[PDB]
Amino acid sequence: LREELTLESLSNVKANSYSEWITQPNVSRTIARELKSFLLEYTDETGRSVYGARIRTLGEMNSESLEVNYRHLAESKAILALFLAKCPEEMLKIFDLVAMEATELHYPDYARIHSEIHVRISDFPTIYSLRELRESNLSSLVRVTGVVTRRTGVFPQLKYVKTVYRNYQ
Amino acid sequence: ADFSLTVLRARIALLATAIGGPDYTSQIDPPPYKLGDDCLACLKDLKRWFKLVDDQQKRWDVAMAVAEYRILTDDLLPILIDWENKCSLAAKLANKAYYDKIALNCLQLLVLMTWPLIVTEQSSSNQITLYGELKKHQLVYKKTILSMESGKVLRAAIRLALDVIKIDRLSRTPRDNMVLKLVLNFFRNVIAIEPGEFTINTKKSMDTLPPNVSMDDISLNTVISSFHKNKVFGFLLTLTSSLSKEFDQDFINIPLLEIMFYFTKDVNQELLFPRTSAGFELSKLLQKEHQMRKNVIKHTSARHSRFGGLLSIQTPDKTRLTVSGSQALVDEKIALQKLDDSKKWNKRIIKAAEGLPNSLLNSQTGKAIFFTESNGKHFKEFINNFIDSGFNILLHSVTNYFTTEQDRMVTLEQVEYLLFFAWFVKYQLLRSKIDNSADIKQVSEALKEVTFILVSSLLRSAYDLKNWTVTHAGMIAFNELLNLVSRTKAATDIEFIVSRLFSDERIQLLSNLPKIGSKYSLQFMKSCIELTHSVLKVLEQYSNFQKVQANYMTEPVIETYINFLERFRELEDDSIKKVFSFFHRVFVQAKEQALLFRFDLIILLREMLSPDGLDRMSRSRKYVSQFSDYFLARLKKRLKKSPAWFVGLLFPPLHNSEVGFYQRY
Amino acid sequence: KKFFSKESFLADFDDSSDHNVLLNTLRKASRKQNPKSSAFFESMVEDIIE
Amino acid sequence: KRRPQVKLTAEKLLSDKGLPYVLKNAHKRIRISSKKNSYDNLSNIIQFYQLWAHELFPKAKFKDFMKICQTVGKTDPVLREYRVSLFRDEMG
Amino acid sequence: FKSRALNHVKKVDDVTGEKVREAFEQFLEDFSVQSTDTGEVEKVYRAQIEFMKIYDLNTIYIDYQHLSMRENGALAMAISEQYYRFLPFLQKGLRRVVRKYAPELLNTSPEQTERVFQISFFNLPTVHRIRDIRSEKIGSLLSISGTVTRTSEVRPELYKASFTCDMCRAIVDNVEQSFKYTEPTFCPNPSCENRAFWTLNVTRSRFLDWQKVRIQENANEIPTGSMPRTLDVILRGDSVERAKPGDRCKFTGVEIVVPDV
DNA sequence: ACACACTCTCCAATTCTCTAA
């Protein structure tokens, strides 16, 4: 509950699988603290903190998606990049909940503009065509290229199962 | 509450890190672990969590917590192995006490977590809930302990013993003697943990190896290899053999009985003696498979399943039946059998042992366990040196204990003693049957008078209180003693021992025993048969005899013999030789023919003798057909002399005084 | 007949005688790796200044 | 109520359809020969008893017929009276 | 509570399987062919295991001629005529040998799941046509040839399954599938009776690669006045996407029978 | 409404145990 792990303590996965290690409360709190500490602190060579400059423009356009480069996340706190590649569906939930704290630090009451923010990953360093995908890739993050052959119309979809919706295509 | 539960789990987890950790300066990728502080208090409080809380509340929750945080695999083994390897290097060269303190206290937890599991109607609902899961985790423990550095933690446990071997018994304090009990108490558990037994609540009538475990991890074969490389067998051998010289016998010699039980269990002795070979016997077995295939083919139609016509069969009194299929057209035997087979009902049926680990008493032992060649020869060497070195000195001590302590016994110690006796006596008889280098003197402590009384007394007391499992084991032990006696008579005091073994009281008991066997499991009846064969054969070579044999011959014994004989598809070639020996005794010698004129015997001889059952060339058919020929000749004579026996053949014989005498003869 | 005495055993006990790339990269980097956050707050305060 | 169950009973055995038929015919039915195998002659004996058991009480498998017969055969006094009567007839 | 153990559970066992297992074991150990250049024993299958260890492979190739000359041919006959019965025993035999000489191969950081080895055979005595497939040969070992005409995309097939109950915190593991998607029969915790609302744990369960391909007879082999027949073939593991439409191929495996699911 | 799959319930058939002649 109260005590937190060091970053070096996370070097050893202690449970029988990654997902069952990320989802533990002390591990999860440690990851949240470390991600927030990365987002408030990463710099260009010129100082000039890029993510403090991106959150600033998020509100200038009344937007909903924060964009994070993977190479920056791999350049320090490397283990978090590894966990992201292995368990994206958990890691992105924690990362989204950190991004809202960081944006509200610039713009208090931004929750009245949009209730929830999505982190977009960029520059993932390995690529497949639609040949190389196999069962080992299941639930892993992947990067793919091709031509868009067909597109449906846009529809609303029920978000939770009082009601809320989201767009779908 | 759930939160109090997880608070204790978290307390344990924090203790699972306060313990220490490896070194990230090291640049040695990876190093070993490195040591914490308060760690004495950490170990001690964990010990308290077991003893002062979980035992007092009867939970097994604490064990579930330590299994969650993987304490055994993660810390205890490297703490011990580092202590061992450090001290090993120091010995190669040829506060330190504090290191040794940590070595002791890590081992005591290893004994505690791997301790074997018992469930009763007095265990808590918590323990009953957790039984199936902690079984999985203990299986993981066995695999891990045998695996690390090819099992090197087992050298740490014996080095601890070697400190207390070291200096004279005259010096050795009670606290000191507990180490020598503790070390052996460890190996008992490591052998005893084995795959689970499935258990459910009988509310409604409707594998447990975890994903990380497999059979070759857990097999007894593995355990042999592991102990041999890590130098255990020398320790058990040296320790048992010099046992008579003033090691205080009291602290060692029951734990040291349990080891010998716990890995004699699940071996048939013939597997240790041979009596391209594998390929040759495989080819022969494929011939047997072809014969079974031929048997199916002989009941298979040539043309397809919808070609089939219809058949009608007319009885006397002009009544008709209908059966389908093309083979029924030609084979009346098949038509008659197929006619009855359609009918729905079967009479529902009745059913003896619980509370103890799998063994000869409640499993079919016609199923070996399997050895590497190196393992086969190493195991043969271990028990051969044990027998030539240790057996008499061990049995003499453990028996003259139990005579002074019989009243206080518990069911397991009884069933251990009776299945350690049995194994070693039989194996030696077989070994000297094979070869002249071996001799019978090595097992000769079994015969002296005190042990004979004790096996007798166990069998007596078990029979009176209707405890059927001890009665079963005692039957097995008492069988071997008699077998050993006939050996020694085929070479003084032994006749005295016989005369005392065959006082009238015991003949009443040993005559009584097959009669009750009719109800019970297939092994129980088999024990009764083999004991009976031996019991009569000794008294045949005593030269009384006519009194004793008439004591055996009556309806409820014959009932057992047939009830056992009809399950012949499952039994050995040898046991049927024993049954027909007895029928030869009843029918030809004693001339008590009237017992066997009963119909369910006549069915049996058709099944077994048909092209269905006993092979056309097994030795069994010689005996069976030679018996049935004589049977039917005497039956013919009886039926024509007195036609009332046609209605006799269905029913039991009739016990009236005035007609019954002429009936039986 | 054998004997297997103590003193022999003590004496003989002692004397006897591609993600494959990326995983290695990230593990080694992981092993190798308020004023610090001032640049962030400076970017926030520049809205006040400019 | 549900329909009561139908069973083998000593009344069926003591009926004229029952056991007297076997004693009236068995001497004529079965015939052994040394000129045929043990298995041959052994098989032959069971034929008549099987067909008779079916004709008497078709409920159940042949073995179950024999084993059912044991209970009533040992317990019922009237059946035992009939049986001692048979063996007295031979004592006559 | 009326707790009760399955005291009667002790299973029936096939002796032929265990003897085939520990005979195939000895063949893998000591086939002991001499060197291509010299009269020196080489032990090629142990060397092949070492090669697999060096490159983290998952399949082993065996020559049917080498098996034919072993132990008067009885082992080869048993494998040939009853492959479907004996394939699990062959797997069990190989697992022990790889444990003995290369335990690094048994696993595929947290814990690592076991490697699903594949045995493969080649150089069989004769090749059949698609027109020679007949129901008497079901489950035997064969080799076939033809021209490829279609191929399917690679799909994941469920091999072993694991489920967890909705009404209580309980888990079921290592459920076996065969031809249709299959789920547990009871809640293992006796404090709960719900049979519904299982969910398949995608992390703990295990899958395989699977591909369907379709072939037709070689044009030069068609008999007089007749037309070419076709067949559907299954590919799994490290052999998917090896085949190409319009090419000519040779296959080996066992013919099977598939139900109306 | 018409064959099916599945659940629930009650009643008597059966075997086991104790007592006395």
Ligand SMILES: [Zn+2]
């Ligand atoms: Zn449930």
